[PDB]
Amino acid sequence: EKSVSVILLAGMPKQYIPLLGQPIALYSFFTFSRMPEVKEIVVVCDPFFRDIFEEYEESIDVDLSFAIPGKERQDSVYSGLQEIDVNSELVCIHDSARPLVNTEDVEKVLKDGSAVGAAVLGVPAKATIKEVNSDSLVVKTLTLWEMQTPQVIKPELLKKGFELVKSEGLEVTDDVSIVEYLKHPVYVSQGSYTNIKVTTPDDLLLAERILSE
Amino acid sequence: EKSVSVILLAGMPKQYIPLLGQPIALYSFFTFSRMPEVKEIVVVCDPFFRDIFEEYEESIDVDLSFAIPGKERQDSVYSGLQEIDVNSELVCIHDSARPLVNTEDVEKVLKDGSAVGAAVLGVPAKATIKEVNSDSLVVKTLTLWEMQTPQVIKPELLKKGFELVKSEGLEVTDDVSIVEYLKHPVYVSQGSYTNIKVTTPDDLLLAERILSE
Ligand SMILES: O=C(O)c1cnn2c(O)c(Cc3ccccc3)c(Cl)nc12
Ligand SMILES: O=C(O)c1cnn2c(O)c(Cc3ccccc3)c(Cl)nc12
Ligand SMILES: [Cu+2]
Ligand SMILES: [Cu+2]
Ligand code: NA
Ligand code: NA
Incomplete structure (x- = not known):
C-alpha cells in the first residue's frame, strides 16, 4: 500500500488533446490514482498545464506533486525523481501519451x-x-x-x-x-497492444476507437 | 480547508530532545497536522532525523515533505519554500524549538x-x-x-x-x-508567553513544567 511513486511525463500538445472530453494525460493519471499501491503522482509538465491535474487533487487518492520538464526525456525523469517521497520503494515512470494502460x-x-x-x-x-x-x-x-x-x-x-x-x-x-x-x-x-502511444492525428482516432470497444 | 503549508524548521540537537518521551520537534508537528487548514508539512531537517517524522506519516492528516537545511535560517526557509504545494494560499513558518504553540x-x-x-x-x-x-x-x-x-x-x-x-x-x-x-x-x-523557544538546558525544564500544568 502506498509504496509507489509515479513520475508522469506530460511535458495543444498531443497529451492534452481530449479523448471523449478528457485530456489524454488524465486517463493514465486516473488509472494510477485509483491504485492503492500508488502513494503519489509527480506530474512533469509545463506550468501552463498544471491546472488540468490540480483540478482533481481533492478527488484523488494520491498526493499530487509537480516537476519542471527538461530538454531530454531523461532530464524530465531526473527532475521528476527529485520530487518523489523519500521512502518510496518503487518509482513508476509513465508517458502520459499512453492513456490506455490497463490497471491489470x-x-x-x-x-x-x-x-x-x-x-x-x-x-x-x-x-x-x-x-x-x-x-x-x-x-x-x-x-x-x-x-x-x-x-x-x-x-x-x-x-x-x-x-x-x-x-x-x-x-x-x-x-x-x-x-x-x-x-x-x-x-x-x-x-x-492496446497500450498505444498517441503521436499522430491518426493515433487519437485509434484511442477513441479503443475506449468505445 | 487544506490551504496552508507549514515549513517546520528542525535543522542531540535541542529540537530532538524528548519532552515526556517525545522529541520536541514532534509537538508542534502534531499540533499543525491536526488542523484542518493545514494541507502539508515541509520538514526542513538533516536527513539523519527524517525518520522521527516519517514514522507518523500514515497517522497524520497532512502530506509530509522534506527539505534540506541551509547555512542561515533564511536559506532553510527558502529551501522549505521550494517544496510547498503550488497552489497553497498561505505558508506558515515555524521553529520546531517552539513545541508549546497552542492551536488557538x-x-x-x-x-x-x-x-x-x-x-x-x-x-x-x-x-x-x-x-x-x-x-x-x-x-x-x-x-x-x-x-x-x-x-x-x-x-x-x-x-x-x-x-x-x-x-x-x-x-x-x-x-x-x-x-x-x-x-x-x-x-x-x-x-x-508559554510559546517558549527551547534553547538552554533550563528551557527543556520549563517546557516539561508547562506540559504538566
Ligand atoms: O528517458 C530515457 O530516454 C531513458 C534512457 N534510458 N532509460 C532508462 O534506462 C530508464 C530506466 C528503466 C529502463 C527499463 C526498465 C525500467 C527502468 C528510464 Cl525510466 N528512462 C530511460
Ligand atoms: O529567516 C530569517 O532570519 C528572516 C529574516 N527576515 N525574515 C522574514 O521577513 C520572514 C517573513 C515574515 C516576517 C514576519 C511575518 C511573516 C513573515 C521570515 Cl519567515 N524569515 C525571516
Ligand atoms: Cu502511432
Ligand atoms: Cu530560554
Ligand atoms: Na474542469
Ligand atoms: Na517510534
Missing part, C-alpha cells in the same frame, strides 16, 4: 519491478526487424519486444543509474539506456 | 496572515528595552513586541521578498527582515 498491466509491472528491481511493460514486436550495418546490409541471424511504459524501478537503482550517466557522460539514445549501463537485470512484463 | 494561537495567526498577507505571533516584551547608539548611550524616547513563530505569509509575497533579498543583496540580521523590505504590512497576532 500496471499491477503486473509493479510486481515485477518490485521483485527484480527494474521492469518495463513490453509486447512482442509484430514487424520483421533487422539490425543493419553501416554499409546498409542486413546483420544476419540463424525474440524482440517493443517497450511500452510504465517502467518501474527501485529508486536507489535509478539514482545510481543517473550518477553513472552524469559522471561518465554516457549516452542515452533509447528509453532503457540507464538501467542497461548497470548490470542489474530488467524484467519485461507482458503488456497489451 | 496558530488559528489566529493563520487568520491574520490570510487577511493581511503577513502575520506573526508576538507577545508584549516584558523587559525594559532601549535602543543604544555606537557610543553606548541610550537613544531616548518620551510598544515593543517580542516575535515568536509561527510567521504566516502569502507565498507570492514571500517569493517576491526572496527575489528582492537575493538581487539587491540586502541583509537579513533579524527574523522579520524580508517582509520589512517590502512595503507590505505585517500584522502582529497576540500569542502566549
Whole structure:
C-alpha cells in the first residue's frame, strides 16, 4: 500500500488533446490514482498545464506533486525523481501519451519491478526487424519486444543509474539506456497492444476507437 | 480547508530532545497536522532525523515533505519554500524549538496572515528595552513586541521578498527582515508567553513544567 511513486511525463500538445472530453494525460493519471499501491503522482509538465491535474487533487487518492520538464526525456525523469517521497520503494515512470494502460498491466509491472528491481511493460514486436550495418546490409541471424511504459524501478537503482550517466557522460539514445549501463537485470512484463502511444492525428482516432470497444 | 503549508524548521540537537518521551520537534508537528487548514508539512531537517517524522506519516492528516537545511535560517526557509504545494494560499513558518504553540494561537495567526498577507505571533516584551547608539548611550524616547513563530505569509509575497533579498543583496540580521523590505504590512497576532523557544538546558525544564500544568 502506498509504496509507489509515479513520475508522469506530460511535458495543444498531443497529451492534452481530449479523448471523449478528457485530456489524454488524465486517463493514465486516473488509472494510477485509483491504485492503492500508488502513494503519489509527480506530474512533469509545463506550468501552463498544471491546472488540468490540480483540478482533481481533492478527488484523488494520491498526493499530487509537480516537476519542471527538461530538454531530454531523461532530464524530465531526473527532475521528476527529485520530487518523489523519500521512502518510496518503487518509482513508476509513465508517458502520459499512453492513456490506455490497463490497471491489470500496471499491477503486473509493479510486481515485477518490485521483485527484480527494474521492469518495463513490453509486447512482442509484430514487424520483421533487422539490425543493419553501416554499409546498409542486413546483420544476419540463424525474440524482440517493443517497450511500452510504465517502467518501474527501485529508486536507489535509478539514482545510481543517473550518477553513472552524469559522471561518465554516457549516452542515452533509447528509453532503457540507464538501467542497461548497470548490470542489474530488467524484467519485461507482458503488456497489451492496446497500450498505444498517441503521436499522430491518426493515433487519437485509434484511442477513441479503443475506449468505445 | 487544506490551504496552508507549514515549513517546520528542525535543522542531540535541542529540537530532538524528548519532552515526556517525545522529541520536541514532534509537538508542534502534531499540533499543525491536526488542523484542518493545514494541507502539508515541509520538514526542513538533516536527513539523519527524517525518520522521527516519517514514522507518523500514515497517522497524520497532512502530506509530509522534506527539505534540506541551509547555512542561515533564511536559506532553510527558502529551501522549505521550494517544496510547498503550488497552489497553497498561505505558508506558515515555524521553529520546531517552539513545541508549546497552542492551536488557538496558530488559528489566529493563520487568520491574520490570510487577511493581511503577513502575520506573526508576538507577545508584549516584558523587559525594559532601549535602543543604544555606537557610543553606548541610550537613544531616548518620551510598544515593543517580542516575535515568536509561527510567521504566516502569502507565498507570492514571500517569493517576491526572496527575489528582492537575493538581487539587491540586502541583509537579513533579524527574523522579520524580508517582509520589512517590502512595503507590505505585517500584522502582529497576540500569542502566549508559554510559546517558549527551547534553547538552554533550563528551557527543556520549563517546557516539561508547562506540559504538566
Ligand atoms: O528517458 C530515457 O530516454 C531513458 C534512457 N534510458 N532509460 C532508462 O534506462 C530508464 C530506466 C528503466 C529502463 C527499463 C526498465 C525500467 C527502468 C528510464 Cl525510466 N528512462 C530511460
Ligand atoms: O529567516 C530569517 O532570519 C528572516 C529574516 N527576515 N525574515 C522574514 O521577513 C520572514 C517573513 C515574515 C516576517 C514576519 C511575518 C511573516 C513573515 C521570515 Cl519567515 N524569515 C525571516
Ligand atoms: Cu502511432
Ligand atoms: Cu530560554
Ligand atoms: Na474542469
Ligand atoms: Na517510534
